[PDB]
Amino acid sequence: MATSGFSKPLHYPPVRRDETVVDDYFGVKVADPYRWLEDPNSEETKEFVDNQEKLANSVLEECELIDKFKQKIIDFVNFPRCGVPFRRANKYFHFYNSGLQAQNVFQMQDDLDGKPEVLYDPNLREGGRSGLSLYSVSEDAKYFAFGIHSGLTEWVTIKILKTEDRSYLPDTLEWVKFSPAIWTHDNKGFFYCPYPPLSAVNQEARYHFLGTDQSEDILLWRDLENPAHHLKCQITDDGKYFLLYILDGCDDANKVYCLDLTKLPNGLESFRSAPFMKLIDSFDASYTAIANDGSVFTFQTNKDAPRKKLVRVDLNNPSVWTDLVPESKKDLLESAHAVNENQLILRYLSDVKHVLEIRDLESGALQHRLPIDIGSVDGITARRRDSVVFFKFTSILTPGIVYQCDLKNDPTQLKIFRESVVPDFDRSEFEVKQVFVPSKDGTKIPIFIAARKGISLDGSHPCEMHGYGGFGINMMPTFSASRIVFLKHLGGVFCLANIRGGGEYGEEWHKAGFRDKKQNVFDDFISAAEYLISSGYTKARRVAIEGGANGGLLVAACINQRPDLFGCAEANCGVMDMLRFHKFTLGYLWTGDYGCSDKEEEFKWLIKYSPIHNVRRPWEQPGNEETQYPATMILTADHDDRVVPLHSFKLLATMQHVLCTSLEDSPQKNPIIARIQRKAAHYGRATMTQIAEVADRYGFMAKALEAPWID
């Protein structure tokens, strides 16, 4: 039962073209008429944003289901959520949200069913604009180190509170982004990885003593000869070794440097770069330390193991590595955790479903295998000394379960510790299945399909498909309240496509969708839409596609290549200028997956799919005269420092020019708009802000797909 779609005439605002900007890339001339949009501070760019906001508001005013979606999302997400607890000393800590708090509150308890005490409430600062990203509790549970944002930048300030009375220490550590705070077992301070004072280059590893100014922090590592190398760090569970991981770019590969803290004459004060044991000193493979017994370390690695494995090495004999748990021939070893003193919990991904294995740490022998339902297990935080492991399970139809596995007393049983419940939602009316569909080259692409049980496969249903496809990221079918609104009140079918470029089948899956093979990602996604149409879930023009960042690139490339397949396209903070992405903020870190236009071979890949360079009028191709672009919403925060908004702005300007304003009477009737969030960064928006964005997104989609509300 179709509704009316977009019909009001659109007044696209004037956008100036700089016709003089032309670059030569290895003999190919590329015009960049919206180069000036790369300056966010100019009056012309600010005017562009104001004008696009005005246009978007006029279009969204005609989407009459926005208010209905908004209230239903609010109602469906209005349930208490307890994060996975973790233990320090004899205290437990976790995040909590009563349902509609702007941000999660960090709580402490004396026991798992004892009275929670609020340690830090981000809702009290700036209306909960930002939540906590860095949170770290000392070994004695006396101190809590956490990161606060000051303004809309990605820079974090680390503060420390005493858990006993919630009083702040005077200590303030600036120039941090994503660093952890890694405590020594003496409780005297912590390792962290700041950048030098005034860009994010020349990252350092430092140690901060409690009660001192940042200027007194001990330098452990820097490398002025490699300014773009970035750092992660870790301390072993016994407190004896500090591990520094050095990474280059976005690749899953790192060095491993090991510092023996017990051999230092006067502790870390001895360094008032330090003498690291350079166990791995190349970028050939990934290595994450799982456990050690003295100098004998157990690592997870992808070395000669695209699906990963566990290996063991003695630091005293560092050339000799031995497999502990061999690489599986089919399943990805996603993570491993030492627990209950002498065991390992392994999280495998087997055809995009989790399987947990409990193994003996010393021998690697399998003890128990726990297959998990469709969804995702994550947040295993238990340490080697802990006998009880907690983790979180979520799925499309399961809002959130915190499971407990007591390895001492009842190791085969997952016990429910906390269970979230969606109000006024009957899970049993819906189902999720996994199917495998062929890509253009024959490759099996897993997809998850969620819908009401017993629907007719008559092509009548609106369909939303989501994907990412890059950077070895695994796309799991997790819970979204807005997705349930779509299924229930729009009679929708939801599809999550596990396309190449992700990590789901290991490094070979990732490499089959990066660099020269990035086009495979788009073909995979297109093939999934074709399957949904051929099998009768939906029809072309009732399919909506959505993705963010690298997934926004996915959306923009697919609508350029196959505009006929889609009725709605929503690209959140997409990477749209593939020739220039490497020049802005941290875009240079992505050249591993994408390539870079400064090399001819790589330019040739990039130009073929770069969204702003491939906008073409589909109706000018013979036999395609009835085709237009789908209704398109480009979403971005106005101060996204991860993916700069110029990408979105240049695509928007290019689409509006090619399809609408360069012609006096264009066949393009579907609107091409941007929803620009004012005063927002990349990082985690407050509950109501996020709900407002998602309601706008679904209202626009409902109108674009001509899908009526049910209820």
Partner: peptide, 18 residues
């Protein structure tokens, strides 16, 4: 504990599974 995937072009301790 600190933010994962930090170098990558990706979006999403989220306040709510919206």
């Amino acid at each position: 504990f600190s933010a994962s995937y930090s170098s990558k072009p990706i979006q999403t301790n989220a306040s709510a599974p919206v």
